[PDB]
C-alpha cells in the first residue's frame, strides 16, 4: 500500500531493516531513528544545483610533471553541439567565465565542468593532460534538480563487584567458557569456568564474580564470551547499552565458529539459529534502573624519554614504564598531537576515576583542534585499539576538514573502520552519511562498499544495512533509479557466470554463452546501466558477438558493452570481467592503497604511471574487474629474454611511440616494484603481471626461496645491461625517489596495512615496518632498496620456473 518504499529499499540493500528475527535489543531500530537528523541536516543543507552536477574537483596544486604539459601557458578545449569549435584558455579560468542558463558536460559521460573553481582544479582535465588526451565537452542544458526530489540511580553509586551467571551452552550438531571484559583489544579482567565434559549441552549454573566494580565499567565495554577446548566459538555483549543503561536479564546468544581479526569484536549474534552454538547467561537483577552518568614543569632527561616514545612508529609496543610516563605527564603529552594514540593507549579504562581525568583532559582541546590534519594520526584513533567514543570523535572531527577528493581516497578504509565501532550509531558512521549525501560520487561508491560487505559478511551486515538504508533515504529519486538498474544487471550476470563454471573443468561452451546471453538482452534487460567502478560511464547493450569465457581454471566472463551515450567521441566498447573463486574484497583494498600511493607521489611531484583498474566486489566469492584495453600478460608474450622488447616494437608503429613506450615502461615498472615490496605482495607468478600496447606494466589477480619483487631479465633487456644503462640508471633513480616518498608517510601506510590485514584477510603486520625500514636514516634506505633490486637480478629466472 502506502509503504511502497521499503521493499524497494530492501532488495537494493540485499537485507531487511524491519526484520527483528535476530536482535535481542532495539539498538538497530534506535540507530535507524537516530540517523534521521543528520540525514535531514545534510539533505536540507546541500545546494540542489551543485549536487545534481556533482563536479569532481580538487584544491591541490597542479604538479610539476603536469606543468610541463601545458601549452605555452595556454590550454585547448573543444565545445560541441554535428558542429564543433576550439577555444584557447588560461589555466585559471572559470566554466561560467569561459562560457561568454546553459552548462558544460564532458562528452560521453555523466560528468560536468561547473562551479567556481579553476579548470586546472578539475579531475577530468588533469586526467586528459596526464594521458595527452583532448578535452571534449558538449553544450547541454543543466539536468533538472527536481529529478533529485527526496521522498518522505547512578552507575557510580554501585560499589559491588560486577557479576555474570553462566547457565550453560548448547549445540545441536575438554570444553570451558572464557569470560573476558574488554575495552578495544585490551582485556580488563578475566574469569573462567571449570573444565567440563564434551556433551552437546553442558550447564555450569554458576555465578561468576569479576574483580571490576560496577562503577568502573566504561562505556562500550564488551562482555566477550569465548569457548576453548582450542578456540572454536565466540560471542560479544555490550555491557552498556545505547541508552547508557547497564544491561540486565537473561540472554541466549548464538555463536560464530573459528576457522587478530575484526570479526572477533562484533556485537552481532549469529542468525543461523539451527546450527550454531549458543550460551545462556544471567545479569544481576535489580528493580530500579542503573544509568551511567556524563602544573609544575618537566625535568629534561624525562622529556627526552617522552620525546623518544612519542617519536616511535604505531606498531612499537609501549612498556608499562612508557605508559606510566605518558600518563603522569599527560598535560605536556597533550602538547604533541602525535602523542595522542600512545597517550590514550596509556589510560586504564577499567578505572572510573582515571577515565574522568581523561575526559576533563580532552576538554583542553586547544592544540589538537589547532593542529594541521594528519590522516595517518587520525586513522590510528579509529582502529581496534580505541573503544572510547570521545577519543574516536576527536578523530572524526579532524576528518570533517577533508575535501570530497580525499574522502574518496579513504572511503573504503573508513567504511571498513566502522567494524571497529562498538555502537551501531557512531560519529564515524554518521560522518560517512553526511559526506555521502553531500556528493553523488562518494554516495555511489559508499553504496557499493557497503553492499559488498552486506552480501558477504554475517558479522556486520546488520550494522552496514541500517547505514545503507540511511543513505538511500536521502540520495534522491535519480540515484535510487540508477542503483536499481545496476543491481538488476549484476544480479543477472553472476548467475550466468556460475551456471557456466559448472559446465567445465573449450569451444563447445563458447557458443553456449552467446545463446544464454541473447534471451537476457531481450527479456529482462535494462538497455542502459551505470558502470559500478566508473559511474561517469553509462553502459548500453552487450556486444554479444564480442563476449567469451576465459582460459583460466576459475571461469570468468569476458564481456563487452556498447556505450549508451551517443555523444561519446569513440566507438570503442566497455569491457568487464565477471569472476568467481577469488575474494574481490582483498583486490579492492590493495587497488585502493595503490591509489593512495599515487596521491602520495603527487605531493612530491612524482608520477609512477600505475594502472589501478576498477574493481567492485558484489557478492559472495564473486564480482567485477575493469578491462584494460590493449593489454597482455607477460607469460603470453613468452609463449626468453629478447622477446619482450620485440613485442613492444611490433605494437609501436613509429619510433616516437616506441620511445614513449619505453619511457612509460620504466616509470610503471619502477612504481609497481616499490608498491609491491612495501605491501609484501612482491613475489608473483608471471601470469599475474600485465603490460599495455604502449608500455604500461600492471599487476593483477590479488589472491595471496622468494624474490622481494618481480624484476626480471626480459624487463632488464628492455632497460639494457646483462646480469648500467641510461634507462637502468633512471629506473634506479626513480625507484629511490619513489621509495623515500613513501617513507615520509611511514605512519600512514603502517596503519592502513594494519587495517587492511584485520578487515580484509602481530608478526603479520610487523612486515611493513621492516619493508619501510623504520628507524634508519635516509642514506641506509637507498642502500637497503638497491640491494633488493640486485637480488632480483642475481636470481634471474629462478622462481619463475619453480612454479610447475
Ligand atoms: C584475455 C586476455 C586479456 N586479459 C585482459 C585484461 C584486461 N584488463 C584486466 N584488468 C585484466 N585482468 N585484470 N585482472 C584480471 C584477473 C584475471 C584475468 C584477467 C585480469 N585482463 N585483456 N586481455 C586482452 N589475456 C591476453 C593475454 O593472455 C591471457 C588472456
mmCIF file with all atom_site columns, C-alpha atoms in Angstrom, residues 319-467:
data_model
loop_
_atom_site.group_PDB
_atom_site.id
_atom_site.type_symbol
_atom_site.label_atom_id
_atom_site.label_alt_id
_atom_site.label_comp_id
_atom_site.label_asym_id
_atom_site.label_entity_id
_atom_site.label_seq_id
_atom_site.pdbx_PDB_ins_code
_atom_site.Cartn_x
_atom_site.Cartn_y
_atom_site.Cartn_z
_atom_site.occupancy
_atom_site.B_iso_or_equiv
_atom_site.pdbx_formal_charge
_atom_site.auth_seq_id
_atom_site.auth_comp_id
_atom_site.auth_asym_id
_atom_site.auth_atom_id
_atom_site.pdbx_PDB_model_num
ATOM 1   C CA . UNK A 1 319 ? 56.015 -0.859  28.149 1.00 0.00 ? 319 UNK A CA 1
ATOM 2   C CA . UNK A 1 320 ? 54.267 -0.212  31.468 1.00 0.00 ? 320 UNK A CA 1
ATOM 3   C CA . UNK A 1 321 ? 57.012 2.348   32.165 1.00 0.00 ? 321 UNK A CA 1
ATOM 4   C CA . UNK A 1 322 ? 56.237 4.167   28.916 1.00 0.00 ? 322 UNK A CA 1
ATOM 5   C CA . UNK A 1 323 ? 52.515 4.124   29.765 1.00 0.00 ? 323 UNK A CA 1
ATOM 6   C CA . UNK A 1 324 ? 53.105 5.500   33.260 1.00 0.00 ? 324 UNK A CA 1
ATOM 7   C CA . UNK A 1 325 ? 55.425 8.152   31.805 1.00 0.00 ? 325 UNK A CA 1
ATOM 8   C CA . UNK A 1 326 ? 52.860 9.284   29.211 1.00 0.00 ? 326 UNK A CA 1
ATOM 9   C CA . UNK A 1 327 ? 50.105 9.318   31.810 1.00 0.00 ? 327 UNK A CA 1
ATOM 10  C CA . UNK A 1 328 ? 51.787 11.193  34.635 1.00 0.00 ? 328 UNK A CA 1
ATOM 11  C CA . UNK A 1 329 ? 52.812 13.940  32.231 1.00 0.00 ? 329 UNK A CA 1
ATOM 12  C CA . UNK A 1 330 ? 49.553 13.958  30.277 1.00 0.00 ? 330 UNK A CA 1
ATOM 13  C CA . UNK A 1 331 ? 49.339 17.750  30.082 1.00 0.00 ? 331 UNK A CA 1
ATOM 14  C CA . UNK A 1 332 ? 52.706 18.069  28.409 1.00 0.00 ? 332 UNK A CA 1
ATOM 15  C CA . UNK A 1 333 ? 51.928 14.934  26.389 1.00 0.00 ? 333 UNK A CA 1
ATOM 16  C CA . UNK A 1 334 ? 48.807 16.772  25.199 1.00 0.00 ? 334 UNK A CA 1
ATOM 17  C CA . UNK A 1 335 ? 51.005 19.423  23.551 1.00 0.00 ? 335 UNK A CA 1
ATOM 18  C CA . UNK A 1 336 ? 52.019 16.923  20.851 1.00 0.00 ? 336 UNK A CA 1
ATOM 19  C CA . UNK A 1 337 ? 49.281 15.601  18.556 1.00 0.00 ? 337 UNK A CA 1
ATOM 20  C CA . UNK A 1 338 ? 51.467 12.607  17.628 1.00 0.00 ? 338 UNK A CA 1
ATOM 21  C CA . UNK A 1 339 ? 51.400 11.520  21.280 1.00 0.00 ? 339 UNK A CA 1
ATOM 22  C CA . UNK A 1 340 ? 47.634 11.079  21.276 1.00 0.00 ? 340 UNK A CA 1
ATOM 23  C CA . UNK A 1 341 ? 47.288 7.364   20.319 1.00 0.00 ? 341 UNK A CA 1
ATOM 24  C CA . UNK A 1 342 ? 50.084 6.299   22.644 1.00 0.00 ? 342 UNK A CA 1
ATOM 25  C CA . UNK A 1 343 ? 48.617 8.586   25.340 1.00 0.00 ? 343 UNK A CA 1
ATOM 26  C CA . UNK A 1 344 ? 45.126 7.094   25.017 1.00 0.00 ? 344 UNK A CA 1
ATOM 27  C CA . UNK A 1 345 ? 46.653 3.610   24.941 1.00 0.00 ? 345 UNK A CA 1
ATOM 28  C CA . UNK A 1 346 ? 48.162 4.573   28.303 1.00 0.00 ? 346 UNK A CA 1
ATOM 29  C CA . UNK A 1 347 ? 44.884 5.164   30.171 1.00 0.00 ? 347 UNK A CA 1
ATOM 30  C CA . UNK A 1 348 ? 43.446 2.433   32.405 1.00 0.00 ? 348 UNK A CA 1
ATOM 31  C CA . UNK A 1 349 ? 39.865 2.276   31.109 1.00 0.00 ? 349 UNK A CA 1
ATOM 32  C CA . UNK A 1 350 ? 38.733 -0.126  33.811 1.00 0.00 ? 350 UNK A CA 1
ATOM 33  C CA . UNK A 1 351 ? 39.018 2.745   36.329 1.00 0.00 ? 351 UNK A CA 1
ATOM 34  C CA . UNK A 1 352 ? 36.160 5.251   36.708 1.00 0.00 ? 352 UNK A CA 1
ATOM 35  C CA . UNK A 1 353 ? 38.312 7.994   38.272 1.00 0.00 ? 353 UNK A CA 1
ATOM 36  C CA . UNK A 1 354 ? 41.016 7.739   35.569 1.00 0.00 ? 354 UNK A CA 1
ATOM 37  C CA . UNK A 1 355 ? 38.516 7.816   32.674 1.00 0.00 ? 355 UNK A CA 1
ATOM 38  C CA . UNK A 1 356 ? 37.147 11.026  34.206 1.00 0.00 ? 356 UNK A CA 1
ATOM 39  C CA . UNK A 1 357 ? 40.596 12.655  34.204 1.00 0.00 ? 357 UNK A CA 1
ATOM 40  C CA . UNK A 1 358 ? 40.857 11.716  30.535 1.00 0.00 ? 358 UNK A CA 1
ATOM 41  C CA . UNK A 1 359 ? 37.502 13.321  29.726 1.00 0.00 ? 359 UNK A CA 1
ATOM 42  C CA . UNK A 1 360 ? 38.498 16.515  31.519 1.00 0.00 ? 360 UNK A CA 1
ATOM 43  C CA . UNK A 1 361 ? 41.855 16.193  29.757 1.00 0.00 ? 361 UNK A CA 1
ATOM 44  C CA . UNK A 1 362 ? 40.120 16.083  26.358 1.00 0.00 ? 362 UNK A CA 1
ATOM 45  C CA . UNK A 1 363 ? 38.225 19.274  27.287 1.00 0.00 ? 363 UNK A CA 1
ATOM 46  C CA . UNK A 1 364 ? 41.506 21.170  26.908 1.00 0.00 ? 364 UNK A CA 1
ATOM 47  C CA . UNK A 1 365 ? 41.342 20.552  23.162 1.00 0.00 ? 365 UNK A CA 1
ATOM 48  C CA . UNK A 1 366 ? 43.140 23.800  22.227 1.00 0.00 ? 366 UNK A CA 1
ATOM 49  C CA . UNK A 1 367 ? 46.190 22.293  20.464 1.00 0.00 ? 367 UNK A CA 1
ATOM 50  C CA . UNK A 1 368 ? 44.547 19.283  18.777 1.00 0.00 ? 368 UNK A CA 1
ATOM 51  C CA . UNK A 1 369 ? 41.807 21.372  17.162 1.00 0.00 ? 369 UNK A CA 1
ATOM 52  C CA . UNK A 1 370 ? 44.585 23.759  16.112 1.00 0.00 ? 370 UNK A CA 1
ATOM 53  C CA . UNK A 1 371 ? 46.943 21.149  14.569 1.00 0.00 ? 371 UNK A CA 1
ATOM 54  C CA . UNK A 1 372 ? 47.181 20.557  10.812 1.00 0.00 ? 372 UNK A CA 1
ATOM 55  C CA . UNK A 1 373 ? 45.176 17.474  9.773  1.00 0.00 ? 373 UNK A CA 1
ATOM 56  C CA . UNK A 1 374 ? 47.060 14.171  9.837  1.00 0.00 ? 374 UNK A CA 1
ATOM 57  C CA . UNK A 1 375 ? 45.175 11.311  8.142  1.00 0.00 ? 375 UNK A CA 1
ATOM 58  C CA . UNK A 1 376 ? 47.642 8.728   9.474  1.00 0.00 ? 376 UNK A CA 1
ATOM 59  C CA . UNK A 1 377 ? 47.292 10.044  13.024 1.00 0.00 ? 377 UNK A CA 1
ATOM 60  C CA . UNK A 1 378 ? 43.520 10.341  12.536 1.00 0.00 ? 378 UNK A CA 1
ATOM 61  C CA . UNK A 1 379 ? 43.210 6.743   11.297 1.00 0.00 ? 379 UNK A CA 1
ATOM 62  C CA . UNK A 1 380 ? 45.173 5.437   14.287 1.00 0.00 ? 380 UNK A CA 1
ATOM 63  C CA . UNK A 1 381 ? 42.478 6.570   16.687 1.00 0.00 ? 381 UNK A CA 1
ATOM 64  C CA . UNK A 1 382 ? 39.762 4.838   14.615 1.00 0.00 ? 382 UNK A CA 1
ATOM 65  C CA . UNK A 1 383 ? 41.398 1.368   14.774 1.00 0.00 ? 383 UNK A CA 1
ATOM 66  C CA . UNK A 1 384 ? 40.661 -1.609  17.016 1.00 0.00 ? 384 UNK A CA 1
ATOM 67  C CA . UNK A 1 385 ? 42.740 -0.171  19.886 1.00 0.00 ? 385 UNK A CA 1
ATOM 68  C CA . UNK A 1 386 ? 40.330 2.610   20.775 1.00 0.00 ? 386 UNK A CA 1
ATOM 69  C CA . UNK A 1 387 ? 36.824 1.872   22.050 1.00 0.00 ? 387 UNK A CA 1
ATOM 70  C CA . UNK A 1 388 ? 36.024 5.199   23.661 1.00 0.00 ? 388 UNK A CA 1
ATOM 71  C CA . UNK A 1 389 ? 33.693 7.432   21.661 1.00 0.00 ? 389 UNK A CA 1
ATOM 72  C CA . UNK A 1 390 ? 35.199 10.740  22.848 1.00 0.00 ? 390 UNK A CA 1
ATOM 73  C CA . UNK A 1 391 ? 38.630 9.562   21.713 1.00 0.00 ? 391 UNK A CA 1
ATOM 74  C CA . UNK A 1 392 ? 37.044 8.431   18.447 1.00 0.00 ? 392 UNK A CA 1
ATOM 75  C CA . UNK A 1 393 ? 35.168 11.742  17.983 1.00 0.00 ? 393 UNK A CA 1
ATOM 76  C CA . UNK A 1 394 ? 38.293 13.911  18.140 1.00 0.00 ? 394 UNK A CA 1
ATOM 77  C CA . UNK A 1 395 ? 39.448 11.797  15.207 1.00 0.00 ? 395 UNK A CA 1
ATOM 78  C CA . UNK A 1 396 ? 36.167 12.098  13.344 1.00 0.00 ? 396 UNK A CA 1
ATOM 79  C CA . UNK A 1 397 ? 36.190 15.866  13.893 1.00 0.00 ? 397 UNK A CA 1
ATOM 80  C CA . UNK A 1 398 ? 39.539 16.104  12.083 1.00 0.00 ? 398 UNK A CA 1
ATOM 81  C CA . UNK A 1 399 ? 38.152 14.224  9.096  1.00 0.00 ? 399 UNK A CA 1
ATOM 82  C CA . UNK A 1 400 ? 35.477 16.910  8.564  1.00 0.00 ? 400 UNK A CA 1
ATOM 83  C CA . UNK A 1 401 ? 38.335 19.018  7.131  1.00 0.00 ? 401 UNK A CA 1
ATOM 84  C CA . UNK A 1 402 ? 38.879 16.675  4.159  1.00 0.00 ? 402 UNK A CA 1
ATOM 85  C CA . UNK A 1 403 ? 37.595 17.754  0.745  1.00 0.00 ? 403 UNK A CA 1
ATOM 86  C CA . UNK A 1 404 ? 35.463 15.172  -1.122 1.00 0.00 ? 404 UNK A CA 1
ATOM 87  C CA . UNK A 1 405 ? 38.573 14.499  -3.190 1.00 0.00 ? 405 UNK A CA 1
ATOM 88  C CA . UNK A 1 406 ? 40.387 12.956  -0.197 1.00 0.00 ? 406 UNK A CA 1
ATOM 89  C CA . UNK A 1 407 ? 37.305 11.242  1.204  1.00 0.00 ? 407 UNK A CA 1
ATOM 90  C CA . UNK A 1 408 ? 37.133 9.105   -1.970 1.00 0.00 ? 408 UNK A CA 1
ATOM 91  C CA . UNK A 1 409 ? 40.739 8.185   -1.269 1.00 0.00 ? 409 UNK A CA 1
ATOM 92  C CA . UNK A 1 410 ? 39.957 6.802   2.174  1.00 0.00 ? 410 UNK A CA 1
ATOM 93  C CA . UNK A 1 411 ? 36.325 5.761   1.765  1.00 0.00 ? 411 UNK A CA 1
ATOM 94  C CA . UNK A 1 412 ? 36.900 2.006   1.681  1.00 0.00 ? 412 UNK A CA 1
ATOM 95  C CA . UNK A 1 413 ? 39.283 2.190   4.662  1.00 0.00 ? 413 UNK A CA 1
ATOM 96  C CA . UNK A 1 414 ? 36.849 4.485   6.503  1.00 0.00 ? 414 UNK A CA 1
ATOM 97  C CA . UNK A 1 415 ? 33.866 2.241   5.743  1.00 0.00 ? 415 UNK A CA 1
ATOM 98  C CA . UNK A 1 416 ? 35.849 -0.779  6.988  1.00 0.00 ? 416 UNK A CA 1
ATOM 99  C CA . UNK A 1 417 ? 36.793 1.101   10.186 1.00 0.00 ? 417 UNK A CA 1
ATOM 100 C CA . UNK A 1 418 ? 33.085 1.052   11.096 1.00 0.00 ? 418 UNK A CA 1
ATOM 101 C CA . UNK A 1 419 ? 33.775 -2.589  12.019 1.00 0.00 ? 419 UNK A CA 1
ATOM 102 C CA . UNK A 1 420 ? 35.858 -1.360  14.990 1.00 0.00 ? 420 UNK A CA 1
ATOM 103 C CA . UNK A 1 421 ? 32.979 0.784   16.252 1.00 0.00 ? 421 UNK A CA 1
ATOM 104 C CA . UNK A 1 422 ? 31.356 -0.520  19.424 1.00 0.00 ? 422 UNK A CA 1
ATOM 105 C CA . UNK A 1 423 ? 27.956 1.114   18.770 1.00 0.00 ? 423 UNK A CA 1
ATOM 106 C CA . UNK A 1 424 ? 25.851 0.965   15.599 1.00 0.00 ? 424 UNK A CA 1
ATOM 107 C CA . UNK A 1 425 ? 25.333 4.706   15.767 1.00 0.00 ? 425 UNK A CA 1
ATOM 108 C CA . UNK A 1 426 ? 28.704 6.455   15.838 1.00 0.00 ? 426 UNK A CA 1
ATOM 109 C CA . UNK A 1 427 ? 30.352 9.746   14.862 1.00 0.00 ? 427 UNK A CA 1
ATOM 110 C CA . UNK A 1 428 ? 32.131 7.913   12.012 1.00 0.00 ? 428 UNK A CA 1
ATOM 111 C CA . UNK A 1 429 ? 29.049 6.121   10.663 1.00 0.00 ? 429 UNK A CA 1
ATOM 112 C CA . UNK A 1 430 ? 27.309 9.492   10.910 1.00 0.00 ? 430 UNK A CA 1
ATOM 113 C CA . UNK A 1 431 ? 30.200 11.227  9.107  1.00 0.00 ? 431 UNK A CA 1
ATOM 114 C CA . UNK A 1 432 ? 30.020 8.789   6.190  1.00 0.00 ? 432 UNK A CA 1
ATOM 115 C CA . UNK A 1 433 ? 26.286 9.560   5.772  1.00 0.00 ? 433 UNK A CA 1
ATOM 116 C CA . UNK A 1 434 ? 26.819 13.315  5.795  1.00 0.00 ? 434 UNK A CA 1
ATOM 117 C CA . UNK A 1 435 ? 29.699 13.073  3.284  1.00 0.00 ? 435 UNK A CA 1
ATOM 118 C CA . UNK A 1 436 ? 27.915 10.539  1.089  1.00 0.00 ? 436 UNK A CA 1
ATOM 119 C CA . UNK A 1 437 ? 24.733 12.570  0.709  1.00 0.00 ? 437 UNK A CA 1
ATOM 120 C CA . UNK A 1 438 ? 26.588 15.846  0.076  1.00 0.00 ? 438 UNK A CA 1
ATOM 121 C CA . UNK A 1 439 ? 28.341 14.372  -3.001 1.00 0.00 ? 439 UNK A CA 1
ATOM 122 C CA . UNK A 1 440 ? 26.913 11.852  -5.529 1.00 0.00 ? 440 UNK A CA 1
ATOM 123 C CA . UNK A 1 441 ? 30.318 10.339  -6.344 1.00 0.00 ? 441 UNK A CA 1
ATOM 124 C CA . UNK A 1 442 ? 31.048 9.432   -2.697 1.00 0.00 ? 442 UNK A CA 1
ATOM 125 C CA . UNK A 1 443 ? 27.433 8.256   -2.318 1.00 0.00 ? 443 UNK A CA 1
ATOM 126 C CA . UNK A 1 444 ? 27.728 5.953   -5.326 1.00 0.00 ? 444 UNK A CA 1
ATOM 127 C CA . UNK A 1 445 ? 30.923 4.406   -4.002 1.00 0.00 ? 445 UNK A CA 1
ATOM 128 C CA . UNK A 1 446 ? 29.540 4.233   -0.465 1.00 0.00 ? 446 UNK A CA 1
ATOM 129 C CA . UNK A 1 447 ? 26.562 2.188   -1.693 1.00 0.00 ? 447 UNK A CA 1
ATOM 130 C CA . UNK A 1 448 ? 28.829 -0.433  -3.283 1.00 0.00 ? 448 UNK A CA 1
ATOM 131 C CA . UNK A 1 449 ? 31.400 -0.549  -0.499 1.00 0.00 ? 449 UNK A CA 1
ATOM 132 C CA . UNK A 1 450 ? 28.578 -1.060  1.990  1.00 0.00 ? 450 UNK A CA 1
ATOM 133 C CA . UNK A 1 451 ? 26.714 -3.547  -0.231 1.00 0.00 ? 451 UNK A CA 1
ATOM 134 C CA . UNK A 1 452 ? 29.947 -5.519  -0.755 1.00 0.00 ? 452 UNK A CA 1
ATOM 135 C CA . UNK A 1 453 ? 30.116 -6.204  2.993  1.00 0.00 ? 453 UNK A CA 1
ATOM 136 C CA . UNK A 1 454 ? 26.381 -6.877  3.496  1.00 0.00 ? 454 UNK A CA 1
ATOM 137 C CA . UNK A 1 455 ? 26.113 -9.692  0.917  1.00 0.00 ? 455 UNK A CA 1
ATOM 138 C CA . UNK A 1 456 ? 29.317 -11.338 2.130  1.00 0.00 ? 456 UNK A CA 1
ATOM 139 C CA . UNK A 1 457 ? 29.539 -10.815 5.905  1.00 0.00 ? 457 UNK A CA 1
ATOM 140 C CA . UNK A 1 458 ? 27.195 -12.159 8.571  1.00 0.00 ? 458 UNK A CA 1
ATOM 141 C CA . UNK A 1 459 ? 29.170 -10.389 11.356 1.00 0.00 ? 459 UNK A CA 1
ATOM 142 C CA . UNK A 1 460 ? 28.440 -6.854  10.125 1.00 0.00 ? 460 UNK A CA 1
ATOM 143 C CA . UNK A 1 461 ? 25.528 -6.865  7.623  1.00 0.00 ? 461 UNK A CA 1
ATOM 144 C CA . UNK A 1 462 ? 23.004 -5.579  10.180 1.00 0.00 ? 462 UNK A CA 1
ATOM 145 C CA . UNK A 1 463 ? 25.205 -2.599  11.062 1.00 0.00 ? 463 UNK A CA 1
ATOM 146 C CA . UNK A 1 464 ? 26.013 -1.789  7.426  1.00 0.00 ? 464 UNK A CA 1
ATOM 147 C CA . UNK A 1 465 ? 22.409 -2.392  6.312  1.00 0.00 ? 465 UNK A CA 1
ATOM 148 C CA . UNK A 1 466 ? 20.995 0.343   8.586  1.00 0.00 ? 466 UNK A CA 1
ATOM 149 C CA . UNK A 1 467 ? 23.658 2.785   7.303  1.00 0.00 ? 467 UNK A CA 1
#
